[model samples]
Target: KKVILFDTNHQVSICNQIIDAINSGIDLGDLLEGGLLTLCVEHYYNSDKDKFNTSPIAKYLRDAGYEFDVIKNADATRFLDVIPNEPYSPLILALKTSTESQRGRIGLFLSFCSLFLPKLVVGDRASIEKALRQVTVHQEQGIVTYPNHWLTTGHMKVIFGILRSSFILKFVLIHQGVNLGHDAYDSIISNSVGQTRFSGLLIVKTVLEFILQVTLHPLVRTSVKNEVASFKQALSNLARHGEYAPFARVLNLSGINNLEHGLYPQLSAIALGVATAHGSNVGEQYQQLREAAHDAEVKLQRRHEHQEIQAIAEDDEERKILEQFHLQKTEITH
Candidate 1:
């Protein structure tokens, strides 16, 4: 449930942060014990030489018994084929953030990995440039200016969008019991971590304020209010499970909580909100679904018992007929 987005400019720093986070007893150890954690790095060369710098973190993962694969230029499909069906561990994707084609491929790979849920996507700002611009508008003078602080403002917007889409996709996939191999849809819900209620409230408030800015159409106003209320209900249902704690913990540990900007907190908040809203809906019906399964199992067991009894009766009848035939043969011989 943790998605760590990074700027490729800070590759070395981010690598160190990842190493530090692991050293501090984050969940990577358990993941490695279950199976090697996959680190897929985009093809890149070192600054000084022609030699490929697969990743700054490659040595650590390999030496520490995890798996690292270097994705050849525009060959993300091969890696997709090799991805394990049940992603018990996080898939860490490292991107150098270059051409549009490469970015599109990476995005495609990421969309596929969303089925796994807890993937860490690493890339330069260009990775999410299009989506970020689409969400953030420049109302005055019609100038589309990128945020000066790319990490905080830019990445958060993209992450929120990615997470929201992920929730909706997962929701549909889970309901239909789609072609997700080896992964029970319930596992996806149980393992999920999300944004906090505090963050949810902030997002709602912002949406409402924006609604008030333009002359509000009555229909639009009611629709927005309905969406807000549904969000609130989702949050309340999510509160019962306390699903936001892990997200909050990751934010604190990753130093996202310490940032001076107000937007920093909302990053975790948005993630929590999306996760809880979807999770609560599924969870409500999950138990009832289990009850139906139990009834099915019981019926099957009773049928099996009846079949066994009928088989025994047939065996007994066969034995009696054979005994009578043997006696008749003995009598004819005498």
Candidate 2:
């Protein structure tokens, strides 16, 4: 056995100085402020996860609306010459609610949003403007793009998620009001990078379902949670093919025979389910949305009777069924 060691002990001088300062209230605020800002940036970055590009400067450039031609890089690059430090720079107001740990998470969430929205106001691109119409709050004047829509589809989802994640950001900063002066517009977009959480996000999804009466909810994180749950039920129906092969096939799921390969068309069913759930829920009923959801319901219920023998990954019937139509083959395998 070999051991490597460096003798060390606490250095008390700094501790003494800090204690002395704390007792006298002499300048700990600066250190605390610096620490908070750093923590906030980290929190926002982690919350974004994968949607935004990794480079801090790229994020800044994209939000800044520097020509798209300038960013046509063969490989992702970071401009070391400049980096956006204060993500909250143009955020007219910020309201947040969280514990110390959650605060960092919330701050990070806000920073990621700032990289796109609040920053976009200065640039004024047409696409970004349309996005801004969705989430950015207006004062006594005109509308603004959130970080002003530097990206697409995910445009307003993150903006809304950021608002929801932090109470401080939600109320104080935005006057805790709804979007664009509409009470019905309480919620905005969702996570661009991934799925929504299992909590209050559902409420947001439910609302979007009502308004858009489209597949947008199903594709997003908040509403997607519901879709995932329903999908699992339908996928589970693929179990015990020895008993329910014909029934599962009724789904007409893609890749019916090749269990090992193919893309999960579960999205189609998800869109149907979303359209279904929202169409009826909305003020004015829609025909197509209703039919798709009706189809999904009928499909899920009929398929579940396939028998309780449980899914066998090796069996083609169950495996094939799970693989093609449903997105939840893994859950059934469990």
Candidate 3:
């Protein structure tokens, strides 16, 4: 249950530390004892373009004949069933957090998949939230009880430390582009609300994506991705266009004073309307939001069918141009 958090710069250093620990005469095979070594990254990168497989640890592991397999947006149940029966293979799980409509479902599924203690978890707020959700559920279930739970308790403590780390401030500010404007002095207070909205979206998106990825497709369809992207764009545009005084009024009417202070009730209200309209059940609101987002994606795809046909025609013309250019090149060579 032990968890360590480090910045991107420290990744290589951490890998070296792990290597050093292993090199201190520990038998890797015996230590793993048929259990797989798992690494979770936020996204799939181009192996040829990136330094992904060039790291010392990755190289060493590859030399040692550890078979590599990548699992992206896999179903939790299917993932569980296959891993235990498979031979000693190192797994790389690309669990993306970019989809803003799926956070809660991801969190829940991750919690369910927490049977094995995570050796390493690399992610920002979205990634950390999945771990946090799992730990919280474990705590609630009393799965890691007192006598043998020191490590689990420490893990939770470490996660809390990571949560409030100074780096997170930079991460949040950069992602939200909150530092772009010169009105920092005036916008800081209000931007906190905007940050809350972003965070809420992250949580909701994580849950929704987990469900869709696990049940529907290993990779979410492009239509859903576009729909969520538009939603976020609209949200940021709304925040960009005004001061929080008016936005705060809307939140206040929804029984939220400051979103940063408390989010579940606020998210519930935002997803399902006012209290009288829908009871303050956060899970129910999350499901409703997921359904709404899915419907929106369907509607968007329906509307874009004509554009898709036009895009195909444009592609054909581009191919013709490519063919013409190749013929010209062949003539020049002759």
Candidate 4:
């Protein structure tokens, strides 16, 4: 077996030297005084997760006039980019969320946010402004083409399993107030890439159900709490079909199977449909999201049942052919 080595090691003298300096306050504070350090820190250490979550940069991007979604790419943590679709250009924010063990030391990519109306990178004002400017310039310069749009759609849906997992992580962290540094997110990312663990719809449906447990008007909670519990019961009983299985049905419904060939179209219809929905109250909003997902789940199950039936028929046909051949051989001999 061949083992790949890396620049940093657990036992190296330099590793201790760097670690020592950090402990002594003689660390990379100056270099990290701006954007680069924050990226490295967030990617490297487990501390300071919430530090960026509420920074001015986050506020600015939240108020930014255009709508965009955080696009997850391995390269985005190093540099931010955008997808230009006509008058709408959505931003993609990538984070390398893990780097501890040999298996994940290089880190994994997590792309998130709404397809439109996305948030910007969380960094110092100077760094945030610079990243925002660069993505805009990329858009104006035509960083994305017609072919690129088509290809990006194909890739994003394929990875929606990971993206939906990130959404669940985001939801639980914010709602449950779990320590943001918990190892669950990386585990989710790893399992998703390996095509194991949870499915995209499972997480999304869980979010819909989670809505009931959190803060809401008593009237609203009473109206929907039991209904939401049904979702939990159903989800707990849902059959495991590997990763992203639910995402395939969603993509198909959003017309990824028909007219919508590009990333923007399918994302605009399905992702935005869920993202932009508004209701008179929190319960209504949760119900709408849950129903949309339920629709997809029903279709997905039917598709699975159809395929299973087809395979069984094929087996029966083969069996009959073998029996016919055996009888014909006896007749010929007689």
Measured by TM-score, the strongest candidate is 4
TM-score of each: 0.19, 0.21, 0.23, 0.24
Across residues 1-334, which tens digit of lDDT does each residue of candidate 2 receive? 1111111121122222222222222322223222222223233333132332464423433433322111122231221111123443332112110122223223233323432332222233432454344334431233222223334545344343333333222212222111112321122222211111212123223333432343343233432354444443544444543322222232222323432111223333344454454342221233454456556555655555553334443376866776776666445642
**Candidate with more favorable, higher TM-score: 1 or 2:** 2
Can you write out model 1's per-residue Cα lDDT over 123-186, one digit (the tens) per residue? 3343244334432433142322333443254334444333333332322222222222232222
**True-structure lDDT of candidate 4:** 0.31
Model 4, 278: alpha-carbon shift in Å? 25
What TM-score number comes out for model 1?
0.19
Candidate 2 contains a number of clashing pairs equal to 18
Q: After aligning candidate 4 to the native by TM-score, how far in Å is the CA of 77 from where it should be?
A: 35
Please give, for residues 1-334, the per-residue lDDT of candidate 3 as tens digits: 1112222322222223322222232223332212113211111121221353464434433443443444332233222222333553433121110122322222222122231112112223343454455445555766332223323434444433322332222222222233232332213322333434333334333434332333432123422444344434334433532332222222222322222213233233233322222222245535665455545545555657979999999999999999999998888542
Clash number for every model? 3, 18, 14, 7
Sorted by TM-score (best first), the order is 4, 3, 2, 1
Which runs of model 1 end up more than 4 angstroms from their true locations? 1-282
Candidate 4 TM-score, true structure as reference: 0.24
